[PDB]
Design a protein around this nucleic acid. Structure first.
Length: 183
DNA sequence: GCTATAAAATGGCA
DNA sequence: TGCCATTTTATAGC
């Protein structure tokens, strides 16, 4: 499923899960080790674990966001660990509705790209304003994925909830990148 | 490090 | 009720 022969590397996974119980954030922040909590900044306890290296945003509602994992399985493993920490803290946390919300991948086609030409020829999908951001923003419709395309041939693919969307979006764009290889 | 991208969670304010 | 606030990650020119 990689005709290009290049497989985008997953770099970040964002997931959510419902602990299914109300949490006392200050009690958690006071008890937990590597946990931060400033209500005036964000209504969540920010906690981190080393393996899988991730950051969790824990809310009073019992909902939790897990960020930074390198794979879907790693994101799920990390989330289970946070649920266990919360449990050991004294809350009857469960693990309801776990869901992958965003997958970020990146790759390198190893050749420079003519961003302006690519954008001009794909006006309905591209946003290229180099003075604001060096990368061309390609908003693909099928699959509905966003790709950041740089002059270097480096590519960021984001917005997928399944890794196949990340791969499909890359495969879809590969021939286009070739058409606009900078000579 | 700040610029922009996607995505979720939730509280606060015009 | 729209948007700001946070967190993560690749990327690269300010």
């Amino acid at each position: 499923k990689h005709p290009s022969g290049i497989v985008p590397t997953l770099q970040n996974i964002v997931s959510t899960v419902n602990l299914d119980c109300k949490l006392d954030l200050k009690a958690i922040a006071l008890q937990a080790r590597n946990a931060e909590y400033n209500p005036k900044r964000f209504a969540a306890v920010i906690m981190r674990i080393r393996e899988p290296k991730t950051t969790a945003l824990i809310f009073a509602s019992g909902k939790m966001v897990c960020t930074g994992a390198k794979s879907e399985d790693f994101s799920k493993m990390a989330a289970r660990k946070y649920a266990r920490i919360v449990q050991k803290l004294g809350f009857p946390a469960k693990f309801k509705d776990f869901k992958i919300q965003n997958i970020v991948g990146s790759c390198d086609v190893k050749f420079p790209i003519r961003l302006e030409g690519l954008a001009y020829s794909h006006a309905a999908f591209s946003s290229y304003e180099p003075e604001l951001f060096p990368g061309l923003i390609y908003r693909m419709k099928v699959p509905k994925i966003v790709l950041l395309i740089f002059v270097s041939g480096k590519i960021v693919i984001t917005g997928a909830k399944m890794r196949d969307e990340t791969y499909k979006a890359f495969e879809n764009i590969y021939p286009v990148l070739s058409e606009f290889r900078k000579i």
